Every structure is written in structure tokens, then in C-alpha cells.
Amino acid sequence: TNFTISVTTEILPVSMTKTSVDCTMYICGDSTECSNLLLQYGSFCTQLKRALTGIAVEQDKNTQEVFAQVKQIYKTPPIKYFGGFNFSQILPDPSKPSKRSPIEDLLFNKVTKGLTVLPPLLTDEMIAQYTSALLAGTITSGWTFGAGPALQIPFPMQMAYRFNGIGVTQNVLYENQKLIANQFNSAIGKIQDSLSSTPSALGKLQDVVNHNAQALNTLVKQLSSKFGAISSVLNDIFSRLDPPEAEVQIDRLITGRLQSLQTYVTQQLIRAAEIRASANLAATKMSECVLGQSKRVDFCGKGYHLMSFPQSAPHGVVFLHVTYVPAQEKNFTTAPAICHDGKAHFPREGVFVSNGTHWFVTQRNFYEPQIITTDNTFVSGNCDVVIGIVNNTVYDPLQPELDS
């Protein structure tokens, strides 16, 4: 008999920090003889440089795929009125010089040698612009902006269409538009307060950042390992021992460093594959939850899915799924069919509902009783085949027209 507009968060990582490693600088450093000895090992450093460049361009391609879903940058109208709905927390704030939403600013604030950390191709400003364009398209133009040209549509009829997408008529939305808007604003405020007050909600992005930093720290600290030799510094063995033994010691250090760097490359490749899968999932969710309505269950949050908001995050994306949750159920007597003049009547779209005395028909997801007429029912066969049929009359709206 009632509904609840619940907004839930979903954080999915997008891309990791792109890194580039120099083989000669990390392994041998400033020793020319060490470089000459390493040059006889083949093309291991070239292979790992190619692998790291492939990882970096994979991250760039993932960012482009998940964020550049459209080619037209839409702009919000100056009059930010949508029938009582509030979107100030998701729209960019002109007061902030970064042109970021307060939710986006909160998510940004909540997230804190031979190796070079390559910056991403797409900066945070153009990512925020992409999110703003997506929000403008999904608010002003509906879901049709992702399927060709953008068609202007006011918010109440877009919400009515979205309710129709889950088998709910627009009459209940138009009869409780103010209540729906107030519930949506309360849900937005509550989810903003929850995101502010919960440090564990950013677990995935923080875990990815910590894993990358810990891998970098381990690769840095692997230089201090002696690897079974006399010293962990190449200078000591170069200026303290004879070249016949210094060559063997240098070989041991370079093969230990090569093994450590190969292990680091393998871990980076596995993490890049996992990030690739996560970014593909995030792109699918953006194509389905944001660019339209998905009839799939639990793909775009708990319960029935109406729409969602895409929000930028550091090395990730945050979704604000708008969900439909029924509440305040009531027991009601039902029957598979109604017998009238030897004919079995079946509901066109709903189900027969009874409160004890009379019989009505209502929707499956909401309580809306109505008189059982011939317009919303269809006849098929007689009453001795169906099981559980009860006795009631069927009103005919055509009958009073010729009765007079």
C-alpha cells in the first residue's frame, strides 16, 4: 500500500595509477659495467617496458570507455526547477573553482628510484565535466540522449515513464508528486550524511591505492636485499673485491633484482586484469543503469531500479542508484478467475483483490482497487475448468448507455 524511494551507493574502481619503470636505473644504477653485463641477458627490460606501456594504455582505454560514453557535452538550464526535486548535491557547484559537486568534493576528500608515476590522460576536471554532461543528459533529456539525438522531456513525465517501466501507473505518481519529491530529497540528504559519516564506504578505492603504494614500496625495498651476497650495494663489491668474483656477485644481484621486478610485473598484470574486469562491469552499469532503465534484478541496486546518478571519484566511479521499495503490505483475499454468466474472467494486467465483502482488481506492485468491468478483463472458456473460481458479477459500462 506504500512505497519508499531509497538511494543506495555503489563504488566500483575504474583505473589504477599508471607507472613506468626503468630497468637499467632500477637494477644497475650508474655502473657502466653492470649495464654491459645486463645487455647480454636479452630483451627482458624491453619486454617489461612493453608490458607496462600496454597496462597504461589499457587503463587509458578503460577510462575513455567508462567516462566518454557520449560525444555531446550537455549543459544544465539556468532555472534548476524540476517539479520540486532537488539536485544541488549532484550538480557542480559554481562557487567551487574545481566545478565539482558537493558529493564529488566529499568523495574526493574522503580518499587520501627508476620508477615514474605517469599521470592519467584524462584529468579530474574533464572527468567532472563528463559526469556533469551525463547528469544533464539523464535529467533534462531522459534516457534517449544515449540512443541518438537528445529529446527534451520534463522530469515528472520522465519519472512517470520510469514507473511504467516497472509496471506502475502514472496516476499514483501524479497523486503523490510532492511526497515523492520530499522522500527523494530526504534520501539524498541521508545518503550524503551516511557517506560523510562512514569511512569504510570507500574500502575498494582505498584498498586499490594501498595495494599500489605497498607494491611500489616493496619494489623499492627489494634493493636493500643482499640476495645471498656479501653486500647489497654494487659499489662495495665493485671497489672491494676482484673482478672474477665481482662479476659473479653482480650477476647474483642483477638476477635477484630481475626476479623481484618480474614478480612485480606479474602482480601488476594480474591487478590490471582485475581492474579491466571491474571497469568493464562499471561501463556496463553506466550503459544500463544511467543511459536507461534496466529490468534486470539487482543489477542496478536493491529492488526495482528507476534511474541512477554517475559521480566522479579518485581512481573510481560512484553510482547513486534510485530504487523502488514497496512497504506497508496488507492481507487480501484473491481468486484466479471470476465466473459471470458461465464465462471465466481473467485480469488484463493485475489480479483480483478482495477485502472480505467485495471484489476489485489492482496492480501487482501497488494497491489501487477498481470496479471489475469488461474493459480491464478478458473472457476465456467456462468456469468448470479453472480451480478456485468464486462467484461475483461483472459490471458493464456499456449497459447504462442503452439502459436509458
Binding site: 557520449v70 555531446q72 557535452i73 524540476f82 590522460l121 565535466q129 544533464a136 533534462t140 527534451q152 520534463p154
Partner: protein, 68 residues
């Protein structure tokens, strides 16, 4: 990348400093990535901020609809 060219047509970006390219205020659909927003292309060799797309502003209203 990672250093300033002052202690090495010179342009400085957040990713690094590049030589042999001229900064253009125009925004074009780039092909050769650079990093940190800048994205060079060939026309001579030029460097510029990459263009997201054509600017559009739909005339939103609460009583207007568009039907193909």
C-alpha cells in the same frame, strides 16, 4: 616527463615539458595522447587541450516535449 626544461618552441605541462610543438588555443579531437589533459596532433606538430565534443545546451522546459 617528470622534470622542468628550465634545467635541461618550449611548452610546459603537468606531465612534463615538450619541445618542437606550438600551443594552440583551439580545441580539436586529438589522436596522439600526451597526458595531463594535453593531447598533441599533427596538422606542423601542435599541442593543445583535447576537446570533449561539441557544446550543446538543450532548451529544457516543464511544458515542452520533443517527438521524432
Amino acid at each position: 616527463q617528470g622534470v622542468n626544461c628550465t634545467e635541461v618552441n618550449v611548452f610546459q605541462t603537468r606531465a612534463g615539458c615538450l619541445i618542437g610543438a606550438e600551443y594552440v588555443n583551439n580545441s580539436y579531437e586529438c589522436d596522439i595522447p600526451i597526458g595531463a589533459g594535453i593531447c598533441a596532433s599533427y596538422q606542423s606538430i601542435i599541442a593543445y587541450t583535447m576537446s570533449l565534443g561539441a557544446e550543446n545546451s538543450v532548451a529544457y522546459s516543464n511544458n515542452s516535449i520533443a517527438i521524432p
